[PDB]
Design an enzyme around this catalytic site. Structure first.
Site, PDB file in Angstrom:
ATOM      1  N   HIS A   1       0.793  -1.108   0.156  1.00 41.55           N
ATOM      2  CA  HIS A   1       0.121   0.002   0.077  1.00 41.55           C
ATOM      3  C   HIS A   1       0.810   1.160  -0.064  1.00 41.55           C
ATOM      4  CE1 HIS A   1      -0.040  -1.412   4.354  1.00 41.55           C
ATOM      5  NE2 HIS A   1       0.338   0.007   4.399  1.00 41.55           N
TER       6      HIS A   1
ATOM      7  N   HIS B   1       5.140  11.305   5.463  1.00 36.74           N
ATOM      8  CA  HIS B   1       4.971  10.872   6.799  1.00 36.74           C
ATOM      9  C   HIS B   1       6.045  10.303   7.330  1.00 36.74           C
ATOM     10  CE1 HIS B   1       0.146  10.763   5.963  1.00 36.74           C
ATOM     11  NE2 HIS B   1       0.663  12.154   6.236  1.00 36.74           N
TER      12      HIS B   1
ATOM     13  N   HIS C   1       7.089   7.310   4.678  1.00 40.66           N
ATOM     14  CA  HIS C   1       6.479   6.716   3.606  1.00 40.66           C
ATOM     15  C   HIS C   1       5.689   7.927   2.831  1.00 40.66           C
ATOM     16  CE1 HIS C   1       3.342   6.410   6.935  1.00 40.66           C
ATOM     17  NE2 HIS C   1       2.622   6.837   5.930  1.00 40.66           N
TER      18      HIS C   1
ATOM     19  N   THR D   1      -3.844   6.657   9.284  1.00 42.49           N
ATOM     20  CA  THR D   1      -4.544   7.041   8.034  1.00 42.49           C
ATOM     21  C   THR D   1      -4.916   5.784   7.248  1.00 42.49           C
ATOM     22  OG1 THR D   1      -3.091   7.694   6.547  1.00 42.49           O
ATOM     23  CG2 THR D   1      -3.938   9.307   7.890  1.00 42.49           C
ATOM     24  N   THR D   2      -4.530   4.565   7.638  1.00 38.46           N
ATOM     25  CA  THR D   2      -4.445   3.282   6.963  1.00 38.46           C
ATOM     26  C   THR D   2      -5.041   2.572   8.179  1.00 38.46           C
ATOM     27  OG1 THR D   2      -2.143   2.909   7.280  1.00 38.46           O
ATOM     28  CG2 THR D   2      -2.813   3.801   5.329  1.00 38.46           C
TER      29      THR D   2
ATOM     30  N   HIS E   1       2.104   9.131   0.270  1.00 39.50           N
ATOM     31  CA  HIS E   1       0.808   9.071  -0.306  1.00 39.50           C
ATOM     32  C   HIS E   1       0.827  10.064  -1.475  1.00 39.50           C
ATOM     33  CE1 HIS E   1      -0.645   7.225   3.259  1.00 39.50           C
ATOM     34  NE2 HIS E   1       0.048   7.991   3.849  1.00 39.50           N
TER      35      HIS E   1
ATOM     36  N   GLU F   1      -3.061  13.732   1.990  1.00 41.57           N
ATOM     37  CA  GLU F   1      -4.210  13.247   2.785  1.00 41.57           C
ATOM     38  C   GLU F   1      -4.511  14.449   3.464  1.00 41.57           C
ATOM     39  OE1 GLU F   1      -2.591   9.601   4.915  1.00 41.57           O
ATOM     40  OE2 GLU F   1      -3.912   8.817   3.394  1.00 41.57           O
TER      41      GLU F   1
END
Ligand code: ZN
Length: 258
Positions: free
Chosen positions: A62, A117, A92, A196-197, A94, A104
């Site tokens: 992901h 992040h 990581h 957020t995951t 996004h 995000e």
């Protein structure tokens, strides 16, 4: 079958396996700059990454994480709205399929091309696993990426992505200095939220930097070449791996600047 960012398993479906998805302190959120409260009591952020020890880079299906040795106080985050020492464990990103989306968090509804992040855990809890179970267990430093000039300190990450194209692939990634990813100013917004995951645990103190960093179109394009799938499976491009903004609810966003 499992969670993801597809049409049949995307964020709108997560609440079925993870009820906390409809919780009271979910992230990300939209940061309204005119509603944000300046708090003079906030101390400047203290980032000590000079002794950071990166070890590996992994594609987990992901996103791709750059992991660090967190067995000692090597790379820590202190100050700001935090109490105690938080150790860097991994970072990581996004990102989106187009430059107009990817982040995000949003600022006055504005979306950035991506969001970085840097995840840290409170040392008083012993390990990462115990930290996530606490309301003050994690501190995540969020940085926005906008498309423009190239970011030299990001190129080493970009160049190694072809080696971890698919889910489960990992590669040795030593001697990487995360200081090269920081903006000039450390002014920030802060609020209480969550991961957020999934598992979407409400254990995070969010610290979102006001100043975004610039990366070139060629750099973010290489992110978009990654795969959600594992090797030997139908190819699904790893793009739009972001969760939309959640209701602010009974929360206040504080700013360290005016
Ligand atoms: Zn994240």
């Amino acid at each position: 079958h499992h969670w993801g960012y597809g049409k049949h398993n995307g964020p709108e479906h997560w609440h079925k396996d993870f009820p906390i998805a409809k919780g009271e302190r979910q992230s990300p959120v939209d940061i309204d700059t005119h509603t944000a409260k300046y708090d003079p009591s906030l101390k400047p952020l203290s980032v000590s990454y000079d002794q950071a020890t990166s070890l590996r880079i992994l594609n987990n299906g992901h996103a791709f994480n750059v992991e660090f040795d967190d067995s000692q106080d090597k790379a820590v985050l202190k100050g700001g709205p935090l109490d105690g020492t938080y150790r860097l464990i991994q970072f990581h990103f996004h990102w989106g399929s187009l430059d107009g989306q990817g982040s995000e968090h949003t600022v006055d509804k504005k979306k950035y091309a991506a969001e970085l992040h840097l995840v840290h855990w409170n040392t008083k809890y012993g390990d990462f696993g115990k930290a996530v179970q606490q309301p003050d267990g994690l501190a995540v430093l969020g940085i926005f990426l906008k498309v423009g000039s190239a970011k030299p300190g990001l190129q080493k990450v970009v160049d190694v992505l072809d080696s971890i194209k698919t889910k489960g692939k990992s590669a040795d990634f030593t001697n990487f200095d995360p200081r090269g990813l920081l903006p000039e100013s450390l002014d920030y917004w802060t609020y209480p939220g969550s991961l957020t995951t999934p598992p979407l645990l409400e254990c995070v103190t969010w610290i979102v930097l006001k100043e975004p960093i610039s990366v070139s179109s060629e750099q973010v394009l290489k992110f978009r070449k990654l795969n959600f799938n594992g090797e030997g499976e139908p190819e699904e491009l790893m793009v739009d791996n972001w969760r939309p903004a959640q209701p602010l609810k009974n929360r206040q966003i504080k700013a360290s600047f005016k």
